[PDB]
């Protein structure tokens, strides 16, 4: 089966989502200073009525909480980026899995 | 359209000081990075300062460090670099640049001479 | 500190010609080198960043390759205005580094 790629299908689907440093007032990054990051959201198995209460009191023990599939990235991929450390350098830094290549259920 | 223009250089005796100014228009100063990069007259490159789109970030290579500040105003769409304790080997054309992954959109330069 | 080494300082070329200028780097940079085109009288400007990377605006003639310390700077078919100095620059760890420059003139 394929991965599904969504924008503004029901199914879980990968959304765009842009990254933007300077809005988030980190300069301490100087590249890249916005990139395509996206994310996972969408639908999973058939829900069974039986499940709902389980589905119900597990959000309200935990809102992060899973009781079941979950709508997530099977492939992510690295972005190399330029930053200022913590002595006064400048460094090119491989930073992994920061990039959503594909969504599907668990 | 993009313009650095720098301003500032001239002749120093060793020791002295010198403050550069590098004039910003054509693009938004306050969200990028921007550096200092010279020109000796052997035609070599060197990286002199990098400051964060902020201002609150800075990096220097050791050959200035202590003795060159880089700072900037971004009220005022100015990069500026203050030289101190200046040596022969800072003669160079100072070139300020906007600062990615690397430095684009160089000005023309300004020359400092060093020299009794 | 890095140093970039190009060990040609002069190459002769033709129009229409292919050229490449090597960089090589004393220590492992990942993909983290930039060409810069210095044409006479003017600053350099940038071509390439993080090896193969064009800089916005950038012909499509000019590319670069390379990972860890060998790099290629590639002009497929050598235009008449391609006359300049190019040089090579790690952006991986500071100290910045530039390499010497490679010279390009037009045969006649």
């Known amino acids: 089966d394929f991965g599904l790629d969504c924008d503004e299908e029901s199914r879980c689907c990968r959304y765009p989502l842009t990254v933007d440093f300077e809005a988030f007032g980190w300069d301490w990054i100087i590249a890249p200073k916005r990139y395509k990051a996206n994310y996972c959201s969408g639908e999973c198995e058939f829900v069974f009525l039986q499940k709902y209460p389980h589905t119900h009191l597990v959000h309200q023990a935990n809102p992060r909480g899973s009781a079941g599939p979950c709508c997530t990235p099977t492939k992510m991929s690295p972005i190399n980026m330029l930053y200022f450390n913590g002595k006064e350098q400048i460094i090119y830094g491989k930073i992994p899995a920061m990039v959503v290549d594909r969504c599907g259920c668990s | 359209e993009v313009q650095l223009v720098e301003s500032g250089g001239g002749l120093v005796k060793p020791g002295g000081s010198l403050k550069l100014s590098c004039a910003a228009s054509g693009f938004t100063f306050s969200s990028y990075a921007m550096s200092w990069v010279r020109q000796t007259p052997e035609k070599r490159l060197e990286w002199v300062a990098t400051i964060s789109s902020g201002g609150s970030y800075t990096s220097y290579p050791d050959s200035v460090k202590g003795r060159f500040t880089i700072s900037r105003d971004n009220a005022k769409n100015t990069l500026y670099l203050q030289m101190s304790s200046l040596r022969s080997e800072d003669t160079a054309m100072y070139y300020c640049a906007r600062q990615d992954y690397a430095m684009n959109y160089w000005g023309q330069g300004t020359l400092v001479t060093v020299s009794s | 500190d890095i140093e970039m080494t190009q060990s040609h300082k002069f190459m002769s070329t033709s129009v229409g010609d292919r050229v490449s200028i090597t960089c090589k780097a004393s220590q492992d940079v990942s993909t983290a080198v930039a060409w810069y085109q210095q044409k006479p009288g003017q600053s350099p400007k940038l071509l390439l960043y993080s090896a193969s990377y064009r800089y916005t605006g950038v012909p499509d003639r000019f590319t670069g390759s390379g990972s860890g310390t060998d790099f290629t700077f590639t002009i497929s078919s050598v235009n008449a205005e391609d006359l300049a100095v190019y040089y090579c620059?790690?952006?991986?760890?500071?100290?910045?580094?530039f390499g010497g420059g490679t010279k390009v003139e037009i045969k006649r």
């Open positions: 620059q790690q952006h991986y760890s500071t100290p910045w580094t």
